[PDB]
Copies of this chain bind each other. A is one copy, B any other.
Amino acid sequence: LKVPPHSIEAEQSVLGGLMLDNERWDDVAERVVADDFYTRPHRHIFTEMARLQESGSPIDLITLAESLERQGQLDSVGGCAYLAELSKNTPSAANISAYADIVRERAVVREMISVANEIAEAGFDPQGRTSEDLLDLAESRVFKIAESRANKDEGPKNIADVLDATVARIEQLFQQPHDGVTGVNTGYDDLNKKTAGLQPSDLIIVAARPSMGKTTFAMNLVENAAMLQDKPVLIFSLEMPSEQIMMRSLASLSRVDQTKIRTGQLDDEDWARISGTMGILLEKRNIYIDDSSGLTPTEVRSRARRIAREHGGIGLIMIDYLQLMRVPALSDNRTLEIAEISRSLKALAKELNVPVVALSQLNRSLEQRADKRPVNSDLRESGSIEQDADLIMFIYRDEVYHENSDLKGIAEIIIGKQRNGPIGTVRLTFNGQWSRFDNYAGPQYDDE
């Protein structure tokens, strides 16, 4: 007896959030519908709310109970006691987005199972149907599942939409830019547009050749995130001691040539800046840095969970870097060792609902080609690194390979994969002296 997959908690949590907040009912309705649940009474409840919204009446405990009682469904749903219990399960109405997505995902899986069951039924008893009929039926069903998903980035835009976008953006541009960003701020406005920030539950990846700013970029992301929020951030520096990492951060935040900090040839002005930086950091006190070497996926999970429980969640996790973690059990097949490491990190990321940034190296084949810009196939020992990654950024600096290149002090962030939104190139200015990246305020060359 195989029980079809579902999510009872998501159903209960979604129902309660809708009861509490009504303005977000449209978002839930668009993402999921009544039929997307697994339990019939919950489908009945969703139908009740949809009817109420069609009439415009507010949705809450009193209105829901009234409608159910009038229609006789109050006893079917366990009465008003279960109606209150539905909201009691829901922590808050803001987190209804994740629960609705889970409900949709289970609904899609259920529909796939039903289609698979129908396919088996037809094949087992042809009834005279030709193979073409069976194949055509199977093909139509597959297209229905694939196409009955909505979402975005699903095809070529038609003409009517293009014309409206053309005229609309032409009119808006000559008045004001109207930047939205609307994302988990990374600190760089040009990067928020193409990523909408670091979305939780993802597994972001940063890759580049040795000495390309891979650790410099990641630290900048950690710093910017810490200032623009209140949740603690965690760092796993498996390569550099906490002292060296902190020295770079002081140079970056205070904009002081880091050579002076390393050699101690500072002056009064520099000491004034550093003192100012230390005051701000100690004011927040929400960064945790671990410099233990050769960790394992179990060890990082245990430590991350402990920090979250003590302070109530983690806003970001950074690892430097992927290939340095160790799995003694699978200590013979490096390829399987990396596969297990990547899988564990992804499982942890969704388990805690927190973005996880992991750095990675690249092969030497990149340097063999005439075009040295990285590609997703250059990841080192990439048994499954590309598969599990939800977002991959490459760091490139043409000045490294060409002294006379006009892109002096310009770094390109190449997005090689993404679940939502496009993929392109983001330019930035790299001030190595301060161990920092800055928004490319200069002439924003059109990206081809």
A residues sitting closer than 8 Å to B (CB atoms) are: 2, 5, 105, 108-109, 112-113, 116-117, 119-120, 123-124, 126, 128, 131, 134-135, 138-139, 142, 145-146, 149, 155-160, 162-163, 165-166, 169-171, 173-174, 234, 239-240, 242-243, 246-247, 263-264, 278, 281-282, 285-290, 292-294, 303, 306-307, 328, 331-332, 343, 365, 368-369, 375-377, 423-424, 447-448
Contacts and interface: CB of A to CB of B under 8 A. Distances in A.
Contacts of A247: 166
A163 B281 contact: yes
A170 B171 CA distance: 53
B108 A159 contact: no
Contact of A142 (B139, B282, B328): B139
A239 B123 CA distance: 41
A264 B174 CA distance: 8
Given A124-B113, A126-B109, A307-B156, A331 B375 contact: yes
Total identical chains: 2
Contact of A159 (B156, B287, B303): B287
A124 B2 contact: yes
A70 to B, nearest CB: 38
A156 B303 contact: yes
A264 B171 contact: yes
Given A135-B145, A142-B142, 6 more contacts: A139-B146, A156-B292, A158-B287, A162-B289, A163-B281, A174-B263
A246 B282 CA distance: 54
A173 B263 CA distance: 10
8 contacts: A109-B126, A116-B120, A116-B123, A156-B289, A159-B282, A163-B278, A166-B243, A332-B365
Contacts of A157: 242, 288-290
A343 B170 CA distance: 40
Given A159-B285, A162-B242, A116 B113 contact: no
Pick the most buried of A157, A234, A240, A368: most chain B CB atoms within 10 A of its CB: A157
A328 B156 contact: no
Secondary structure of the A contact surface, majority rule? helix
Nearest to A368: B332
Contacts of A282: 159-160, 163
Contacts of A163: 246, 278, 281-282
Contacts of A105: 131
B135 A146 contact: yes
Contacts of A165: 243
Contacts of A117: 120
Nearest to A145: B135
A246 to B, nearest CB: 5
Contacts of A234: 156
Pick the most buried of A131, A159, A169, A368: most chain B CB atoms within 10 A of its CB: A159
Pick the most buried of A138, A165, A286: most chain B CB atoms within 10 A of its CB: A138
A176 to B, nearest CB: 13
Pick the most buried of A156, A289, A332, A447: most chain B CB atoms within 10 A of its CB: A156
Pick the most buried of A240, A243, A286: most chain B CB atoms within 10 A of its CB: A243
B160 A134 contact: no
A155 B375 contact: no
Nearest to A107: B131
Given A163-B246, A243-B166, A285-B160, A155 B343 contact: no
A177 B293 CA distance: 24
